[PDB]
Design a protein around this ligand. Structure first.
Ligand code: CLA
Ligand code: CLA
Ligand code: CLA
Ligand code: CLA
Ligand code: CLA
Ligand code: CLA
Ligand code: CLA
Ligand code: LHG
Ligand code: BCR
Ligand code: BCR
Ligand code: PQN
Ligand code: SF4
Ligand code: SF4
Lengths: 83, 80, 38, 121, 741, 145, 63
């Protein structure tokens, strides 16, 4: 297994740029997934002690980002290792 | 260990010896039956007491008999 | 002759005999209902 | 970096039970400290006196109670398992020193966890 | 390459072998000397790969036997339609779906059994049915008894054709092995031809018959006054009145102006407020979308024209560095073993029956199903049981594959071989997970029983004490509630009201509403996780150790089904793969019993019930699940004891058959324990004394009486245990829900 | 059967409703409904969501006894070979688990013997049978009078 | 007007994709160089791609 930690560098920029496309409107904004997700952490780390509720869409921006990131980086391992 | 005995009504068919998965039994020369051979149980230290030998014995009643005795690593069939 | 041998097999004759038996008992209770004594 | 063998046995090698140089007592002591410290947690927060003034005391005493049973268990194991006696852990003398280490460690570790929660309540 | 090749006039049609019991087996053909032979005849009758070594001859029996099964299914369906036509209140029920109880079984007046002809309404007396046939037939647009009669006759003609085809493809035109091994062709045809065209042609029925009939029924038109289905096809103006898109005809389909069919093909979600069923315009569109998917899917596999995938090439390509030769060999395994295929197919069909159970209660697909609580409870429970049995069967056939069909040459360093090579790691970890799940799921109930009994309600796992909120399930409910207009932009309403949003009522009765998950729901879900992991432990252990263990190194030679390898090695009772299936059945029974009890109680407590004019929900068991379902005592008292009231008070009423069957089923269950707890050695010795008495009176039979085999004792035991246990719940459920629902 | 009969006949006598026994005892639903189901109510309400009373111990014992009875079925229905094969994997796992594999059994763990499991199964069955009825016969009578 | 144009392009692209995509193309056809089986296969793909694209742009109010 060649490893090469640069797979993680491509996994971030590769997914983030693809996820930063402008969407329609609701429970996202129209900016994108990342722009909503990076805005969700900004207004949550502002109140560092008191964490999010189940009502908050942060939990959706977390799962759909990570389940997209983990998908893009796992398929990143197979590609670099198995040319 | 288990005790395996061969009684005189043994017809020397070899079926018990063929059935034994532990090689406990063997056929020995004997004038007592037409087959000219009798089952023997020389290696009963290896006998697990599965009674495949008795299942195979065609005589009524059995000519080979397994008396389950004191358990050992070998007789309990333990690979640990 | 082979069909008749089949119809003489245990389960067929048992089915037909117990059908006939059940029919007689059912029909006796249809015409003589609620017989608690002779 | 193999992961299965290299990182596994590399990590395991540095654990107090396996680490080269340690006397049975210091292996025990390190194992004790680690266990005593975390073992107080469930008793403090989920025990029958968790919503009383005795929440923390009850939690500490319970942990010491459990640790005593574990140490007695250790001693019984060693007595039964090791008829032979030597300085190494897997021996009558070594296992008793390990047990002594574990008990001191775990009572101290428990005590230390109790001290920090009182310090930073 | 893909060709039809058959042998002609391969088996003469003669009654000769009918008069020769056990002709099919070399061991049985000689006939009985003992009663064991009679059982063996039946146990072996369908074990075709034991009769002959020829894969061709096995395949041909299977294909022909399958037609026998379809023939029987057609007789059964025909029966259901004929009973609907002749002995039902279906026509009356169409005019009052909420008021009349569906009934399609009338009992004869004999020995007082006519008490079972219940006051169901619609001018008949009969047994209330829970199969949901009326809701199915109403969804299909059936309004009169002629339509049901003609379907029943059609069914008998299909049964006849299936019998002819079974006979024909065994006796006259038997396909060769190479015909059956056309898996690529079979999958193209089954995907595009069976599922694709099935769904397309059904969508056709829905758009042309179901839609117009149900729209007029839902508007309140008298079913007799509704135009017959063919009038909607003949007169397009009739159809255009109901769905204006029919003005534009098929021009919008060929021109890709598909939005014109927004009236007939919708994405409304939710339920009809009239019927409490899925919108049939949603269902018609679903079936169109599925049909396309399946017709497209069935172009995947290479047949006679170069294009398409080799399933062999696909399997062999899916090879990584952690899984050796990967899926190499599996194409050979699945083209040479019927049991391998039956293993997969039962796993998926069984798992499908369970998915169907969950989807059909929560998204009630049929009109007036949701508020027919007997039907809802019956359909969920039924499809759970069928699913459970199929999954255990998957275990049986996976293990039969391992004993009879597995070769190390085919499975060399492939995923199957590699699994066998760490069976100890697999089973040790699953064992551990079963102990972890059992202690931390069932332990919570025992903790709770103990704390409640000790007067320590504040020390319990409950919504009001130590809360275990199923926060992930709660979070998923929220996402599904927020879906319409958001992540499902064109969906007007939720897939299911089970997830959130509104309470749907039909009359006063609740069709569906949000199913709130709390501590009681968290706890029972971990029981389900637990009971499923253990069942998997038993069946998977059966498969991975089918051929050998450290205990029995030559287990494959002893076969799939054998009682033991004797009392030695400490005792080897129930080492066989068959005995794992035997044990798997009890755990499946355990697992699914708790599922259908969870369902029954949760739905009665928190979902089903009445909504007043004020608009206050009164549930059947008034929300007792949250505080009662967190202790075993609560299950015993507030579920079994409380809800058994209906079945045990049923004597002298139309539900008395359920009371009788409740006791009858308890009897059969208890009777099973005689077989499960005993051994044939006792029974053979008892029979010796009974045989002595017959010999004394010169009335001993030539067919020597034998105690059942060790294996048959177990088979009889588990069969009566399951029959008794399941039939008990059946009587309990139907008596309960027909009374209170 | 003997003790059920004694108890129901006496419950009916003591209540002054001999007619209940006389009419209900001639069919088995009468026994299930008018004896077992009817008299279970005080017992199973020994504790409930609303609180607990002096019958809580009989309610808890009752469930305990049903559990013990059912645990017996495991030993009576599932026989040795299943268990010995499972124990083999657990022995395998223990020896290959780091830290844990420093600890050694002195006695090789094996599945219970064929006869042992009959005895252990019968003891759970018998204990469950006795404690279940003890809790019922005491709590049903104590709860009623 | 846009529907025939997109459909012809999608069919022509699927035909071009087909020359590289299909295992062992014909090259015994005057201009397209695919056999009838492959022509039906590619045009079938071109229809699915065409219908899906058209419905994509129609849903987005582009055509
Ligand atoms: C199997 C044994 C059996 C026997 C001995 C009888 C005997 C009889 N049947 Mg019955 N019958 C049977 C089975 C049987 N039936 C079955 C299985 C059916 C259902 C198909 C019927 C349906 C039936 C009808 C409809 C009638 C009879 C009638 C009769 C009586 C005619 C005289 C006679 C007592 C006739 C009668 O006299 O009753 C009015 C009559 O009308 N039977
Ligand atoms: C095991 C013992 C048992 C006994 C002794 C009885 C006895 C009786 N039952 Mg019961 N019953 C039983 C078990 C038993 N049953 C079981 C297990 C069930 C559930 C299936 C029932 C369900 C049942 C019902 C629902 C009914 C009965 C009825 C009867 C009466 C039938 C009289 C009759 O058929 O006409 C007379 C029959 C003959 C004289 C037979 C003659 C045979 C041939 C033809 C004579 C040939 C000439 C030589 C009789 C008192 C009926 C009754 O009327 O109760 C008062 C009734 O309606 N039984
Ligand atoms: C089996 C599951 C189960 C669970 C989870 C609980 C939980 C609880 N019980 Mg109950 N109880 C149970 C079953 C259970 N019980 C049963 C079967 C009975 C018999 C009737 C009882 C009878 C009972 C009584 C009489 C009492 C309790 C009490 C309690 C509470 C405190 C117990 C305590 O201090 O534990 C101590 C726990 C530990 C020392 C450790 C637990 C295990 C650790 C956390 C595992 C960690 C593994 C880790 C992740 C591995 C990582 C390794 C590496 C990677 C680093 C707690 C809420 C008490 C209470 O007051 O209730 C509120 C109490 O008085 N229980
Ligand atoms: C869906 C149910 C079903 C189906 C499709 C089959 C199909 C079959 N059975 Mg099986 N069978 C079944 C249920 C079924 N059976 C059940 C529940 C049992 C009891 C355990 C048996 C016991 C059994 C035995 C003992 C034998 C069969 C045999 C057969 C085969 C030949 C039958 C034939 O040629 O008659 C043609 C059938 C008709 C013309 C119609 C039936 C008419 C009757 C009288 C009604 C066929 C594969 C025979 C065989 O040769 O298998 C290798 C055989 O000897 N079966
Ligand atoms: C119509 C007349 C007919 C005749 C004379 C034959 C004759 C024969 N068939 Mg053929 N066959 C037929 C129709 C016929 N078949 C049909 C309709 C089918 C499609 C199912 C087949 C498919 C078929 C197969 C797959 C096989 C045969 C075989 C045979 C031979 C042995 C059959 C035997 O012993 O069955 C006697 C068995 C029965 C009478 C039981 C039949 C069970 C039926 C199908 C289902 C019963 C319904 C339901 C389950 C009942 C439940 C009731 C409840 C009490 C539980 C014999 C030459 C076998 C053979 O070995 O030939 C060389 C063989 O393997 N046949
Ligand atoms: C369009 C093609 C087509 C269709 C519809 C089917 C359908 C079926 N096959 Mg398959 N099969 C096919 C092609 C097809 N096959 C090909 C090419 C092969 C060789 C590669 C196979 C090899 C095969 C085997 C080996 C087996 C099957 C079996 C089945 C049945 C599975 C059980 C089921 O789902 O019952 C669903 C039942 C129905 C939908 C009712 C009966 C339908 C009948 C048979 C007619 C359907 C088609 C007809 C054109 C309809 C006309 C419509 C009308 C309006 C004009 C099912 C009837 C199994 C079986 O049960 O065989 C008896 C089985 O063992 N098939
Ligand atoms: C109520 C009846 C009952 C109970 C309690 C058990 C229990 C068990 N079965 Mg058995 N089983 C049963 C009926 C039962 N079975 C029957 C009738 C059959 C015949 C079909 C079987 C056949 C069978 C098979 C074939 C298998 C099982 C397995 C299991 C184990 C599952 C793992 C687990 O959860 O362990 C944990 C224990 C429990 C959940 C029981 C109670 C736990 C309590 C509440 C918590 C702990 C209490 C604490 C330690 C007590 C201290 C008190 C003390 C100091 C006095 C578990 C030991 C499987 C197994 O071994 O999995 C690894 C397995 O493969 N069973
Ligand atoms: C599903 C997640 C599986 C993750 C396993 C990891 C995974 O997907 O890896 C899969 C990994 C892939 O290997 P290859 O790259 O060689 O696969 C090529 C394939 O074509 C051949 O199968 O194979 C393994 O290492 C075997 C699996 C062992 C894993 C051991 C743990 C198994 C227990 C899992 C417990 C969690 C279950 C949660 C269910 C909700
Ligand atoms: C989450 C996570 C995890 C886990 C974790 C863990 C597992 C941890 C643990 C930890 C621990 C478990 C710790 C502990 C500690 C302890 C301590 C810190 C102690 C100390 C003590 C002291 C300080 C003292 C003592 C004493 C006294 C006091 C007295 C006398 C005696 C003596 C001396 C003993 C991991 C990593 C996997 C991964 C990532 C994430
Ligand atoms: C209920 C029931 C029944 C009934 C049944 C029925 C009555 C059925 C029907 C069915 C049907 C009646 C079907 C149909 C079908 C059809 C189809 C499947 C078609 C299709 C077609 C297509 C696919 C097309 C194509 C195309 C294209 C794509 C291109 C252009 C042109 C066209 C359009 C031509 C019975 C009796 C069995 C009994 C049991 C139950
Ligand atoms: C009760 C019991 C028996 C005894 C049961 C036997 C032998 C089966 C009884 C046979 C029944 C009664 C059918 C025989 C009926 C004849 C075919 C006659 C029919 C007459 C008419 C109805 C046609 C065992 O042999 C056995 C073996 C292994 C484990 C447990 C047990 C077990 O529990
Ligand atoms: S099977 Fe019996 S008769 Fe044959 S050799 Fe062995 S002991 Fe003798
Ligand atoms: S008790 Fe029965 S199953 Fe167990 S070893 Fe003996 S003969 Fe075999």
């Amino acid at each position: 297994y060649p490893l090469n930690p640069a797979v993680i560098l491509i996994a971030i920029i590769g997914w983030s740029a693809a996820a930063a496309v402008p969407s329609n409107i609701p429970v996202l904004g129209g900016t994108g997934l990342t722009q909503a997700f990076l805005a969700s952490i900004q207004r949550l780390l502002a109140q560092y002690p008191t964490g999010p509720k189940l009502d908050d869409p942060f939990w959706f921006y977390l799962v759909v980002y990570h389940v997209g990131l983990f998908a893009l980086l796992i398929f990143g391992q197979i590609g670099y290792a198995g040319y | 260990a288990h005790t395996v005995k061969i009684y005189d009504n043994c017809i020397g068919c070899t079926q018990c010896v063929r059935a034994c998965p532990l090689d406990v039994l063997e056929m020995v020369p004997w004038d007592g039956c037409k087959a000219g051979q009798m089952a023997s149980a020389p290696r009963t230290e290896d006998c697990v007491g599965c009674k495949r030998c008795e299942t195979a014995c065609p005589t009524d009643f059995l000519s080979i008999r397994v008396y389950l005795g004191g358990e050992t690593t070998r007789s309990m069939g333990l690979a640990y | 002759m082979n069909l008749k041998k089949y119809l003489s097999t245990a389960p067929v004759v048992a089915t037909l005999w117990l059908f006939l038996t059940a029919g007689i008992l059912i029909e006796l209770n249809r015409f003589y209902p609620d017989s608690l004594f002779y | 970096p193999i992961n299965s063998s290299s990182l596994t046995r590399g990590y395991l090698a540095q654990l107090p039970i396996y680490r080269s140089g340690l006397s049975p007592f210091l292996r025990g002591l390190e194992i004790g400290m680690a266990h005593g410290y975390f073992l107080i947690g469930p008793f403090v927060e989920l025990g029958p006196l968790r919503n009383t003034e005795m929440k923390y005391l009850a939690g500490l005493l319970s942990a010491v109670g459990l640790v005593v049973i574990l140490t007695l268990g250790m001693l019984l194991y060693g007595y039964v398992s090791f008829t032979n006696d030597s300085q190494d852990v897997e021996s009558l003398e070594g296992w008793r020193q390990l047990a002594s280490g574990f008990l001191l460690g775990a009572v101290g570790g428990a005590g230390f966890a109790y001290l920090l929660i009182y310090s930073f309540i | 390459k893909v060709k039809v090749v058959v042998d002609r006039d391969v088996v003469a049609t003669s009654f000769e072998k009918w008069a020769k019991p056990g002709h099919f087996s070399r061991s049985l053909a000689k006939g009985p000397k003992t009663t064991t032979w009679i059982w063996n005849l039946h146990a072996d009758a369908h074990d075709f790969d034991s009769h002959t070594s020829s894969l061709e001859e096995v395949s041909r029996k299977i294909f022909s036997a399958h037609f026998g099964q379809l023939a029987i299914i057609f007789i059964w369906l025909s029966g259901m339609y004929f009973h609907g036509a002749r002995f039902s209140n279906y026509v009356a029920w169409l005019s009052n779906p909420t008021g009349i109880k569906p009934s399609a079984q009338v009992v004869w007046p004999i020995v007082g059994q006519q008490i079972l002809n219940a006051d169901v309404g619609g001018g008949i007396q009969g047994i209330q049915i829970t199969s949901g046939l009326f809701q199915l037939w109403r969804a299909s647009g059936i309004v009169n008894e002629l339509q049901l009669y003609v379907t029943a006759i059609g069914g008998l003609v299909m049964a006849g054709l299936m019998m002819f085809a079974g006979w024909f493809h065994y006796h006259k035109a038997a396909p060769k092995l190479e015909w059956f091994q056309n898996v690529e062709s079979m999958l193209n045809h089954h995907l595009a031809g069976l599922l694709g065209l099935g769904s397309l042609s059904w969508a056709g029925h829905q758009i042309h018959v179901s839609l117009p009939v149900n729209k007029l029924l839902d508007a309140g038109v008298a079913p007799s006054s509704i135009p017959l289905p063919h009038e909607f096809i003949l007169n397009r103006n009739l159809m255009a009145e109901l769905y204006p898109s029919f003005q534009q005809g098929l021009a919008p389909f060929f021109t890709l102006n598909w939005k014109q069919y927004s009236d007939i093909l919708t994405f409304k979600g939710g339920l009809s407020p009239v019927t409490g069923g899925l919108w049939l315009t949603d269902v018609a569109h679903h079936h169109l979308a599925i049909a396309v998917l399946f017709i497209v899917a069935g172009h995947m596999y290479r047949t006679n024209w170069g294009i398409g995938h080799s399933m062999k090439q696909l399997l062999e390509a899916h090879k990584g560095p952690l899984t050796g030769e990967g899926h190499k060999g599996l194409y050979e395994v699945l083209t040479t073993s019927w049991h391998a295929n039956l293993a997969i197919n039962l796993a998926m069909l069984g798992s499908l029956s369970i998915i169907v159970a969950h989807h059909m209660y929560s998204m009630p697909p049929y009109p007036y199903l949701a508020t027919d609580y007997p039907t809802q409870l019956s359909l969920f429970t039924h499809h759970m049981w069928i699913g459970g049995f199929c999954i255990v069967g998957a275990g049986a056939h996976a293990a039969i594959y391992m004993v009879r069909d597995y070769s190390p040459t085919v499975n060399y360093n492939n995923v199957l071989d590699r699994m066998i090579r760490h069976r100890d790691a697999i089973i040790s970890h699953l064992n551990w997970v079963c102990i972890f799940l059992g202690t931390h799921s069932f332990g919570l109930y025992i903790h709770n029983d103990t704390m409640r009994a000790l007067g320590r309600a504040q020390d319990m796992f409950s919504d009001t004490a130590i809360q275990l909120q199923p926060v992930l399930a709660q979070w998923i409910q929220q996402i599904h509630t927020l879906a319409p207009g958001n992540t499902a932009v064109n969906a007007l309403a939720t897939a299911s009201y089970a997830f959130g949003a509104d309470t749907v009522t039909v009359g006063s009765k609740i069709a569906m509403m949000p199913i709130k998950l709390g501590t009681a729901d968290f706890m029972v879900h971990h029981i389900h996780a637990f009971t499923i992991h253990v069942t998997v432990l038993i069946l998977l252990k059966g498969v991975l150790f089918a051929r050998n263990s450290r205990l029995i190194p030559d287990k494959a030679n002893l076969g799939f089904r054998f009682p033991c390898d004797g009392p030695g090695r400490g005792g080897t009772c129930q080492v066989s793969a068959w005995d794992h299936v035997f044990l798997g059945l009890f755990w499946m029974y355990n697992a699914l019993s708790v599922v259908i009890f969870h369902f029954s109680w949760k739905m009665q407590s928190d979902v089903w019930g009445t909504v007043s004019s004020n608009g206050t929900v009164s549930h059947i068991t008034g929300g007792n699940f949250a505080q009662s379902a967190i202790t075993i005592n609560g299950w015993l008292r507030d579920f079994l004891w409380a809800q058994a009231s209906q079945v045990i008070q049923s004597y002298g009423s139309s539900l008395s058959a359920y009371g009788l069957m409740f006791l009858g089923a308890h009897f059969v269950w208890a009777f099973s324990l005689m077989f499960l707890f005993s051994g044939r050695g006792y029974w053979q010795e008892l029979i010796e004394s009974i045989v002595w008495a017959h010999n004394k009176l010169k009335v001993a039979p030539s067919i020597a009486p034998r105690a059942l085999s060790i294996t048959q004792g177990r088979a009889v035991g588990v069969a009566h245990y399951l029959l008794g246990g399941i039939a008990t719940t059946w009587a309990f459920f139907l008596a309960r829900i027909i009374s209170v629902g | 059967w003997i003790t059920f009969y004694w108890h129901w006949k006496h419950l009916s006598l003591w209540q002054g409703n001999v007619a209940q026994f006389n009419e209900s005892s001639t069919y088995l639903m009468g026994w299930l409904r008018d004896y077992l189901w009817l008299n279970s109510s005080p017992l199973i309400n020994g504790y409930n969501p609303y609180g607990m009373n002096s019958l809580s111990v009989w309610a808890w014992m009752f469930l305990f006894a049903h559990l013990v009875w059912a645990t017996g079925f495991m030993f009576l229905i599932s026989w040795r070979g299943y268990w010995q094969e499972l124990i083999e994997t657990l022995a395998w796992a223990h020896e290959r688990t780091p830290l844990a594999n420093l600890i050694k059994w002195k006695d090789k763990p094996v599945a219970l013997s064929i006869v042992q499991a009959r005895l252990v199964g019968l003891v759970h069955f018998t204990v469950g049978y006795i404690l279940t009825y003890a809790a019922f016969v005491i709590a049903s009578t104590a709860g009623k009078f | 007007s846009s529907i025939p144009v997109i459909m012809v392009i999608s069919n022509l692209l699927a035909l071009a994709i087909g020359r590289y995509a299909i295992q062992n193309p014909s090259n015994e056809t005057p201009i397209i160089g695919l056999n009838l089986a492959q022509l039906v296969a590619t045009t079938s793909f071109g229809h699915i791609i065409g219908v899906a694209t058209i419905l994509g742009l129609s849903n987005m109010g582009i055509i």
